[PDB]
Symmetry: D2
Subunit: 336 residues, 4 copies
């Protein structure tokens, strides 16, 4: 059986998730909810500044739009309690608005005429299972009603930290992600509705420090690293594409070659490995959740003690979205 | 030490609202006593202090309860979405700078004029066909001071108007098309996403695209230069600079002209609002300038075939500070003559 | 890749934006093969820049550096680093037609340096090449070629955008005179930050990704090389703006006939083909990056301003100054190679 | 009583140095050498994308230009041995081309018709005195013939690292500078003359990793930190303005408040202190060589051991230039 999915928030993550679902057999989108009309959503699906033209035909209709002739209903309900997901057979909602990223808020979708389960496309608090595909999706059994796909940065950091910890033992660490600007930053200096005096600044014209919980919350994905990491972000003027640096001390003294070999050994469809001196535009659109860059590995040793630096790339858009849809595809197969 | 001031309120402490506040600091006859926006005083104080394109504030800013002090002088801050709930009169406010983008029509702006409100409103944008629309030093003579709502026009209008008027007075504009290559603004999306105004092009990442867009400046020029009503139209290309813009105008004229003739006519019309340059500048060179319009003699062109000519004239403007300088010139003058 | 299409061997002088994108498009045609690349650098730099491309994406295939060149899908291509075309032994690698894409030899006598006794046989300049070389916009005037030419020009990006639009408008309604503005991506000839411009251009000296930068362009004045009836009728200029590729051309004219917006748009759509596209969607510049049209007419930007019975008419066409031009350039190269003799 | 100065390389640092010298008494520029016509240099001095209009008048003349009425000679000699610095009385040369930044190369200026001293506006190798003003300018005695004003990153890092080391003892450290793009990166993807596969990439459209020697070479300015630090850079799309992050282990456990207090106590004209959540555009044009940002300080502690993070802003243009001219001014006064 195909599992019918709804998208709440047809934004950067919602629209790219829709795109990837077109190539998934076990899942199909039957309903989109946002705050606008079908022509606006159909246009944003067709044309994409950073991810290119949509691969398919899109035609606006009354009450929605057709993708290759398949009608998808569009509604514009600000309150999840008012989205009649059940009318379109939706069982799983991708909660991608940025405004319901907590357990009780996501549960608003699960009313009498709503859906059955929710995947939050963001950190969702410490009382919802938080899944980085191919790092801890084993924790799912399908009975969950609300789960989280974590953040872009968590999906980048987690395979790198886990491989390094499994091989050498992370004692403590600090993370800096140099991160594309996102839709939550202001295009020009102005009041930020979340009260962030730095996200209030022109996002494409500044290096912007910002907090991020990815390192401090890593225990949701790698329990043994709870209480071991912290970090922050520098938001910079690229419209997508990011990189995560992690500096740790380890239980073992290591060489750069030994580090790079341990990362390569852990590589898979989610965690890539490169030795090419790439830049951020080269990871736009990739499907790895995290691309380890061996060219940036460093070890600083003084008096027999080492600081170790490991670096991994990610397209905060498509890398995260590929991970999100892998998790959604797996969750849908085992949902009950 | 003096008290010869008209008290002003700012609705919308945004790019234009904050820069207007900055310029009013150097005006003796007007004083801002009340700001209304949608946020708390620390956000507004911080945005006044630090400014990506216009630099650090020239003075001290300190957050206080219910507002902030600028060089020790308290400015009250409120956060009322609806003008009917702003008690402008409590702070002695006579004139409101309506700079939110959400009340830029006569009946909307008049919401500030309730029984506990202000006496007059200046809309920092085009305000419709039924409010006096003023480009300072081009038509501020139309004001008599009895008006309750006026418009400061748009940035593009304040750039276009002195150039079009100088050209029309000298040679007679028959018809024209305008293109403004314009910085992105806060009404465009930082990344591709639903645009609340329904504009499928403003929906696109504004700092990563050349974005065509409509503009009414040329079509509505008759509010400022009546002789040019029904003679001009145009459009915009929004491009990835965070401020700074340029207006190109192509016309046919009653008289055949040379490039030197055109440039001389522009220079003879230059003043505090309409500048003149022969240096090959680029857009960053006009950020912060106080001209409403800076004619660029290096871009003038004449294309003649069979004794008929197309004429091109180009003028720079900082859509932020150029407009704001014009806006505050108009506010200062209006304040002097207000009922 | 067993086929019966005759193959002409091509060399690329200047493995830059146009040179590398030309190489990419030639991968997908069979009548032409690149067997030699000349630039000023080492093979690993060129291989890396082929593999990874900020605006046009990852190369479609494998690229591996080797001694003296690199392999593309396992096929070795020789790389040399000769500053003077007279020292490029094109003939050693069987090259018969050279793509002159350095920007430093864009005139007849300069391009002929490639045609020495151990050199090539013909040159295609990837730029305006002067008044005395045939200048070709594919699907507008490539019929002027007879195959005997030794040096030809693929014109400029702006010319390939403007030409089909101006030709269609002129054929339908008669252009009397016109002015053009192209709002154009910055290019490699602008400075990344304020600094001395080798060409002496005080505006290309300025930081290209941080400014709106006016600049000259000869596309409108030189249109007579492509559309003879429009010689002496057009002029224009450019505004370079901060996008790394993607451009748009506005043309304002007066016409022999009074027209409506719908009549203009209809005339453009009737003239559409592989080189001249037509859209009614409200797109922006990133939507044409990588497009293979030389020119994409945008019906949403058409305007007519009429006063006292006379009209100004505005028509607008998009172009990726990189891939739009390169698609046209390789169409012309492919056609030229077929008829070359 | 006025030392005459020549500028080789009227670029970003050369022109901003000229601008700052306008406002000091002891030195005056009497000769400019570059590779171009006087109108090009006059135009670039008058109009400046990131640093604003020149404060004064600039008029092109024959063989040079006038600044506020005073003629400055302009020449275009590619080889320093051909620059007759002596005929304009030039005593000290600011070597700001980027092409003569080592001892023997800079000494080409000191020919029989040349200057007597040269200040390299860049790292100049490990055999020339390397000066960060108000950190180690006391090493100069005035007899030197070639000195170095270090790099922008060094002038940022040094006062921060010195104050932290003096207070708590740095054991080892790794540095990341998130740095504006510069003139040595390509405006669009193309062959990089220095052979750098990452500086070959479009500088205003990418996050670009790159090496930097500031941390490894810190021993030239702070000898006790020789062999203790390393690091790297991420070049990002702002045209000027940068930030330096430093992660260390220390001999003493500390609090965030203790760190911030130690930095504020060390603040002076070169080393600023802020607690405001600023972004990169807020330090453009600033005259601190380094502006410590107390809002980004972090301490990560596990098992009684800590990683400590300290961060400082710098306008790689004007911050470095203010430091360079401070050193030039002092060097001129003790020159012998
Ligand atoms: N790099 C990224 O962009 C990224 C990466 C990983 C996770 N996320 C997370 O994904 C979520 C969405 O981020 P985004 O970048 O796509 O933002 P976005 O602004 O592009 O999309 C949000 C969408 O939600 C719509 N919306 C807002 N409120 C709504 C409501 N009450 N009801 C229905 N629709 C509503 C908006 O109109 C918009 O289309 C956030 O939680 C964000 O933290 C973003
Ligand atoms: N180049 C320019 O930016 C420019 C030039 C000329 C005119 N204008 C005009 O000035 C006006 C403001 O433009 P801007 O660029 O400064 O926009 P902005 O977004 O920077 O500022 C708008 C401000 O209004 C606040 N606000 C929004 N709704 C409000 C409400 N109901 N009540 C109180 N405050 C509210 C917002 O929080 C914001 O601070 C627009 O009408 C615009 O067309 C802008
Ligand atoms: N939008 C565009 O970029 C565009 C569009 C149409 C036409 N053109 C034209 O194509 C040509 C190349 O433009 P580009 O953007 O690719 O520039 P580019 O700088 O990216 O490439 C030029 C290449 O030529 C190399 N080179 C320079 N001098 C050389 C020499 N003497 N010998 C061998 N190689 C040399 C350079 O190292 C570089 O790789 C120009 O004539 C330009 O006007 C460019
Ligand atoms: N953030 C910065 O820009 C920065 C900061 C600190 C130090 N530096 C250092 O300052 C130096 C210059 O940097 P920049 O950014 O100002 O570069 P730039 O390209 O802006 O200026 C260099 C100038 O030198 C000219 N020039 C080149 N070769 C010459 C030669 N043989 N003879 C005479 N003039 C020549 C060039 O025409 C140019 O004007 C570099 O060593 C650089 O590492 C730069």
């Amino acid at each position: 059986m195909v599992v019918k999915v709804g998208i709440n928030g047809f934004g950067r993550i919602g629209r790219l998730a829709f795109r990837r679902i077109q190539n998934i057999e076990g899942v199909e989108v039957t309903r989109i909810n946002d705050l606008t009309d079908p022509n606006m959503l159909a246009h944003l699906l067709k044309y994409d500044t950073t991810q290119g033209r949509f691969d398919g035909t899109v035609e606006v209709k009354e009450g929605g739009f057709e993708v290759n002739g398949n009608f998808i209903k569009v509604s514009a309900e600000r309150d999840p309690e008012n989205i009649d997901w059940a009318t379109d057979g939706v069982e799983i909602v991708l909660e991608a608005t940025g405004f319901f990223a907590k357990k009780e808020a996501a549960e608003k979708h699960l009313h009498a005429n709503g859906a059955k389960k929710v995947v939050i496309t963001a950190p969702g608090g410490n009382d919802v299972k938080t899944v980085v595909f191919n790092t801890n999706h084993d924790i799912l059994d399908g009975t969950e009603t609300v789960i989280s796909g974590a953040s872009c940065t968590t999906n980048c950091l987690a395979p790198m930290a886990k491989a390094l910890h499994d091989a050498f033992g992370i004692q403590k660490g600090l993370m800096t992600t140099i991160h594309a600007y996102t839709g939550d930053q202001m295009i020009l200096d102005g009041p930020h509705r979340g009260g962030d005096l730095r996200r209030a600044r022109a996002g494409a014209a500044n290096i912007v420090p910002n907090s991020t919980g990815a390192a401090k919350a890593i225990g949701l994905v790698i329990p043994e690293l709870n209480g071991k990491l912290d970090g922050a972000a520098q938001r910079v003027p690229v419209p997508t594409g990011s990189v995560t640096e992690l500096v740790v001390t380890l239980d073992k003294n290591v060489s750069v070659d030994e580090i790079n070999s341990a990362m390569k050994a852990a590589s898979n469809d989610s965690f890539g490995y490169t030795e090419d001196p790439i830049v951020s535009s080269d990871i736009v659109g990739v499907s790895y959740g995290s691309l380890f860059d061996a060219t940036q590995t460093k070890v600083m040793e003084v008096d027999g003690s080492q600081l170790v630096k490991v670096v991994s790339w990610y397209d905060n858009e498509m890398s995260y979205t590929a991970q999100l849809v892998r998790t959604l595809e797996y969750f849908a197969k085992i949902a009950k």
